[PDB]
């Protein structure tokens, strides 16, 4: 139900963050705008 | 013929850590607490778990704010 | 007062069936009838049975013969 | 028999909510605003000493103009900044006073920014 997920840069493709989500509340893939160290700017991240 | 008790936590060493009138270095802890037993005054900030620290070098002075409360301040 | 929520409240005149007094009122329905009431302004009209005619403060079946006879169109 | 909620009392309750985070110091004083149903007042205060430095209001002997009393705040804001600059004040903080930063108080603030006052 409450699993661990990893977020991936939509441009780079490198996993950068790990969070949690509810499987039966957010069955889709979460998308958040986080900071990407490789590009040194805010880039959209979505779950693998 | 048995007891269901026998459990206790680990003590958290709360209470004051610096005395009134004592010169104190910036960034040092002054009072560890749960909740807000003493409010942060001048040059004093409250941390995540309510520990009052000092922002600048000075002299610790515990002092009384309004009728039913206390605060701690640091004066250069 | 916010736009797009409340139905209309344009004024409509109100009358009786026996005394037939032209009384102003605010309502959302015009009773499919309208009059040039008051000083040259166009106000709809409501018709219903005796209201406040008595209010406990004022034969061929009686109405059986009268209502059916008037119903003859 | 509904009793009416006092206007000033409720405003004073909202006044202290902002006033916790805003206090005027000697170097960076506080600009206060009191709005009345017929006038509007502005004041510059340094709360460390409890002293008023400079002020102006829609009651002075000049700028006589009452164009719906909304642009009168613009004139009032034009005097406090001028008097602050004359007295050597550079930067301040806007004390909303418990009102809403929308209308008359917005216009007063906008005029001060254009003239010699730094926010």
């Amino acid at each position: 139900m409450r699993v661990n997920i990893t977020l991936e840069c939509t441009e780079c493709g490198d996993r950068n963050y790990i969070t949690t989500k509810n499987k039966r509340e957010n069955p889709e893939r979460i998308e958040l705008k986080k900071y990407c160290p490789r590009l040194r700017r805010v880039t959209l991240h979505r779950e693998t | 013929g048995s007891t269901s008790n026998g459990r206790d936590s680990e003590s958290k060493r709360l209470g004051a850590k610096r005395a009134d009138g004592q010169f104190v270095t910036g960034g040092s802890i002054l009072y560890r607490q749960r909740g807000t037993k003493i409010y942060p005054g001048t040059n004093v900030g409250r941390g995540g778990d309510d520990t009052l620290f000092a922002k600048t070098d000075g002299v610790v002075r515990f002092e009384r704010m309004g009728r039913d409360k206390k605060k701690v301040s640091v004066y250069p | 007062m916010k736009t797009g929520i409340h139905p209309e409240y344009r004024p409509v005149v109100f009358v009786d069936t026996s005394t037939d007094f032209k009384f102003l009122s605010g309502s959302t329905k015009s009773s499919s009838e309208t009059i040039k009431w008051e000083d040259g302004n166009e106000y709809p009209l409501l018709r219903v049975e005796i209201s406040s005619d008595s209010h406990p403060f004022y034969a061929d079946g009686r109405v059986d013969r009268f209502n059916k006879k008037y119903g003859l169109k | 028999m509904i009793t009416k909620i006092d206007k000033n009392k409720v405003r004073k309750k909202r006044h202290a909510r902002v006033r916790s985070k805003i206090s005027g110091t000697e170097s960076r004083p506080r600009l206060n605003v009191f709005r009345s149903n017929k006038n509007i007042y502005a004041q510059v205060i340094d709360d460390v000493n409890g002293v008023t430095l400079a002020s102006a209001s829609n009651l002075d002997k000049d700028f006589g103009s009452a164009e719906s009393k909304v642009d009168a705040a613009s004139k009032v804001g034009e005097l406090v900044a001028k008097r602050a600059s004359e007295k050597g004040i550079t930067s301040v903080t806007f004390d909303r006073g418990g009102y809403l930063y929308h209308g008359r108080v917005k216009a007063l603030a906008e005029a001060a920014r254009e003239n010699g006052l730094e926010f």
Binding site: - | - | S25, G26 | M1
Partner: protein, 175 residues
């Protein structure tokens, strides 16, 4: 504003010299009118919750707003949250026209019209009212309403005691 004409030009002048009020500012006057339904059958009758909402609006014209419970009671298996009742606030000029559909039209229409309670005062200056059948308004359709619910109508006046409060409405007109 037909009642307002009497209220502003005929009712009030007969009160200033009647109770020796030191100023017109002490003359009692209407403040607001409210309507409450409290149809609690929405625990299972989901459609009925919104069924009477549009019915209540047509009596006034303003959109009613959904009112939810304040807590949960085990006796009536009530859970916090579900719509329980509706709110309509007649305010402003509306205390001068909506009641005209009452004191002239509504009460004569009821099947057993005899009058209003002379004692139905809260004890401090307000007056309430009750209706037992939901098709009393002049702008209601008999065939369009499937269910009937008991309403609560409250008239709020700035009167300080039940003496003057009764005799403004008595002068305003109803048994």
């Amino acid at each position: 504003n037909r009642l307002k004409d009497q209220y502003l030009k005929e009712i009030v002048p007969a009160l200033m010299s009647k109770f020796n009020y030191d100023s017109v500012m002490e003359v009692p006057k209407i403040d607001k009118i409210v309507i409450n339904t409290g149809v609690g059958d929405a625990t299972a009758n989901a459609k009925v919750l919104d069924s009477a909402v549009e019915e209540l609006a047509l009596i006034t014209g303003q959109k009613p707003v959904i009112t939810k419970a304040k807590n949960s009671i085990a006796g009536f298996r009530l859970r916090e949250g579900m719509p329980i009742g509706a709110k309509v606030t007649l305010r402003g000029e509306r205390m001068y026209d909506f009641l005209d559909k009452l004191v002239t039209v509504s009460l004569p229409r009821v099947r057993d019209f005899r009058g209003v309670s002379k004692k139905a005062f809260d004890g401090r200056g307000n007056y309430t009212l009750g209706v037992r059948e939901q098709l009393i308004f002049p702008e209601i359709d008999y065939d369009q309403v499937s269910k009937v619910r008991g309403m609560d109508v409250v008239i709020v006046t700035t009167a300080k005691s039940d003496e003057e409060s009764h005799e403004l409405l008595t002068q305003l007109g109803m048994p």
